[PDB]
């Protein structure tokens, strides 16, 4: 008959930060079917995108071969082959099956605001809950990580930040209650604030928020 892959098909999760030559899997085989017990050669025949993986041809150990990135290629479908090496290379008896490599998400990305500087305006005397008018799209930071490491919370900083509240989940900025804004109070009538976006690993990004206080 044939040699046999014993532990394939197999699913394994490794860190997207697994360094080059770190262990991924040990592929096991037997040639007890045909009863020959001939010497076995392993190889990866398909799915090996940019040769990100390396299989030791005598031991069947699969190692990381290039830097990995869940954000670039999150999953590999590797076809592993085992063959005997008889005098004629067409007597060659073979078996083929799948080693599926999932990359577990590492927190290697930080929240990036959609703008370096947001341009905003608030009318003086505006009541509590009045949102900023933000003229370059909504306040938004995006974190490229998968799910848990991509949840963003927002804070607002600088002198006269206390006139406003930020929803620490949506990034929406509103006038704080008990505060009414007098344009004549401010020299100049123009605030330079800092927006801060943080993931649960405390990796953050920042953006300027420039606010014109308008007349009425």
Contact partner, 109, from Ca ion, Cl ion, none, Cβ < 5-8 Å per class: Ca ion
For residue 131 the two structure tokens come to: 């949102």
Strand 164-166 relative to strand 173-175: parallel, antiparallel, unpaired? Answer: antiparallel
From the list Ca ion, Cl ion, none, which binds 46 (C-beta under 5 to 8 Å, kind-based)?
A: Cl ion
Q: Hey, which residues does 171 pair with through a beta bridge? A: none
Q: x-or-dash pattern for Ca ion, window 97-126, by CB under 5 A?
A: --------xxxxx-----------------
Binding to Ca ion in span 3-32, by CB under 5 A: none
Q: Judged by CB, which is closer to Cl ion: 8, or 196?
A: 8
What number of other Cβ atoms are within 10 A of residue 139's Cβ? Answer: 24
Q: Is 145 in the site for Ca ion (CB under 5 A)?
A: yes
Q: Using CB under 5 A as the criterion, what x/- string covers residues 64-93 for binding Ca ion?
A: -----xxx----------------------
Answer for the pair 120, 214: CB distance below 8 angstroms, yes or no: no
* 153 part of the interface to Ca ion, by CB under 5 A: no
Q: Of residues 143, 156, 166, 195, which one binds Ca ion by CB under 5 A?
A: 143
CA angle 69, 73, 77 (to 5 degrees): 125
Asked whether the beta carbons of 173 and 121 are under 8 A apart, the reply is no
Sheet-wide strand order for 117-123: 133-134, 117-123, 204-214, 190-198, 153-157
Which residues, 175 to 204, sit near Ca ion by CB under 5 A?
199
Residues within the interface to Ca ion (CB under 5 A): 69-71, 105-109, 143, 145, 149, 199
């Amino acid at each position: 008959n044939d040699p046999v892959l014993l532990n394939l098909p197999m699913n394994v999760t490794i860190s997207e930060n697994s360094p080059v030559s770190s262990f991924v899997a040990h592929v096991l085989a037997s040639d007890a079917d045909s009863g020959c017990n001939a010497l076995l050669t392993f190889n990866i025949t398909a799915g090996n995108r940019e040769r990100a993986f390396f299989i030791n041809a005598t031991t069947g150990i699969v190692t990381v071969n290039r830097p990995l990135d869940r954000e670039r290629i999150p999953e590999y479908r590797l076809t592993v082959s085992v063959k005997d090496n008889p005098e004629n290379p067409r007597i060659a008896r073979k078996d083929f099956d799948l080693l599926l490599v999932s990359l577990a998400d590492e927190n290697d990305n930080h929240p990036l605001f959609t703008e370096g500087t947001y341009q905003a305006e608030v009318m003086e005397n505006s009541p509590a809950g009045t949102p900023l008018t933000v003229l370059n799209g909504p306040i938004l930071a995006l974190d490229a990580d998968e799910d848990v490491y991509a949840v963003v919370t927002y804070q607002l900083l600088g002198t006269h930040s206390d006139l406003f509240v930020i929803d620490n989940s949506t990034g929406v900025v509103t006038v704080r209650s008990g505060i009414i804004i007098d344009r004549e109070a401010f020299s100049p009538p123009f605030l330079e604030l800092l927006l801060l976006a943080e993931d649960i690993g405390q990796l953050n990004g920042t953006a300027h928020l420039f606010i014109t206080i308008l007349d009425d």
